[PDB]
Amino acid sequence: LQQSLELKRKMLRDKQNKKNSGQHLPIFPAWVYERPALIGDFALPIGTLPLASQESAVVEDLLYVLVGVDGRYVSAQPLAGRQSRTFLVDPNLDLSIRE
Amino acid sequence: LQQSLELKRKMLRDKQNKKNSGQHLPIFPAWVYERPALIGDFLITALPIGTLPLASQESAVVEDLLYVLVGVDGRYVSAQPLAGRQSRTFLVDPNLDLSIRE
Amino acid sequence: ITEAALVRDILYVFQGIDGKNIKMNNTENCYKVEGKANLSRSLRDTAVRLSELGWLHNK
Amino acid sequence: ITEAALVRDILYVFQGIDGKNIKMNNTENCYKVESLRDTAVRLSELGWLHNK
Amino acid sequence: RLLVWTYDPKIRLKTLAALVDHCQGRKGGELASAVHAYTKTGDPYMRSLVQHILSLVSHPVLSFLYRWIYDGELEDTYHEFFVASDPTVKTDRLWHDKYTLRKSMIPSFMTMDQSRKVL
DSSP states (O other), X not given: OOHHHXXXXXXXXXXXXXXXXXXXXXXXXXXXXXXXXXXXXXXXXSSSSOHHHHHHHHHHHHHHHTSSSOOXXXXXXXXXXXXXXXXXXXXXXOTTTTO | OOTHHHHHHXXXXXXXXXXXXXXXXXXXXXXXXXXXXXXXXXXXXXXXXXXXXXXXXXXXXHHHHXXXXXXXXXXXXXXXXXXXXXXXXXXXOTTXXXXXXO | OOHHHHHHHXXXXXXXXXXXXXXXXXXXXXXXXXXXXXXXXXXXXXXXXXXXXXXXXXX | OOHHHHHHHHXXXXXXXXXXXXXXXXXXXXXXXXXXXXXXXXHTHHHHHHHO | OOTTTTTHHXXXXXXXXXXXXXXXXXXXXXXXXXXXXXXXXXXXXXXXXXXXXXXXXXXXXXXXXXXXXXXOOOOOSSOOSSEEEOSSOXXXXXXXSSEEEOGGGOOTTOOHHHHHHOO
């Protein structure tokens, strides 16, 4: 989360005084984190449909969700401590297909 | 536009007295400069509807803009007169669609 | 109409021979175009631009 | 609004100009859609990075 | 939505925003040493992207260093070179005191011995 910037400061101060070979050394973009899509991760009723249409809406959403972003129904809970982030899949699909 | 009629007298004079009896410089005839058909610009049909179909906007706007590039007029766009100063102002339609306008 | 008529028409305007969509051939010194498709840049602007080459040839 | 209008407007957003349902916010150079809204917001950063 | 099509420009645009936003308010050999700060790296996708911008920015700098390694002179309102020529010097104090070595416009491929030998 925030801590990365502090790491980038402490590394950079460490990088400089060892070798002065570089000139006007670069510092990593803060605007990568500002704009939400430089990072790889962030309709129809979903309960009153029959089972086949439920599975077709679910396959369309899961084809989005394999790469990180909120889908059309399923989103991912916030980052805070998770280095291995999972998603929170929405139900109303049958309990056979849930596995 | 009409200020140019001044220059063509005065800039001759400085050269005229230099030759003073030699082979002096003729004037190019006036009709050359009366005509706007030796200029790309033409200085001054259209169907406003609100430009509602986008797919036809794509086909029509590019022909009119290609005209406006060389100084010939379009329909929806039209070049409006600025030869008093070296520029040009072009008039767009106020009903032109928000994407196509920018 | 078609532009293929305009090529052979402005050809006549060049020579000082009577045109086809146009009837002024240095009898007023202004060129007056008759609308057959009502184009204001491809029947009027281009035609009056090219007509001055015929006026020069007449001269 | 439909997904069909949003996909033709994201192409306009890519040029750096405003779509007909996705419009500029002045708190960034970021486009905002008038669930699936986040997916369109993710693609609108291309027009942001174009603007800059 | 076609996320796949637009992730490959999401990296190219990332690097271009890097070079543009970071090098704001720099000119001269402060700009030929801010874009020569991105071939000091180990990301081979970024080094090649920079090597179509670095080649362009280096050419006026090496033009001025041909008029200041042999016959010629540069004088303009904004010098993009390390010489700061001194107008209206008629005295003999020109031995280094007419052509000051401006350290801020030294580019990144010249060291201290390299930018001072050439003057």
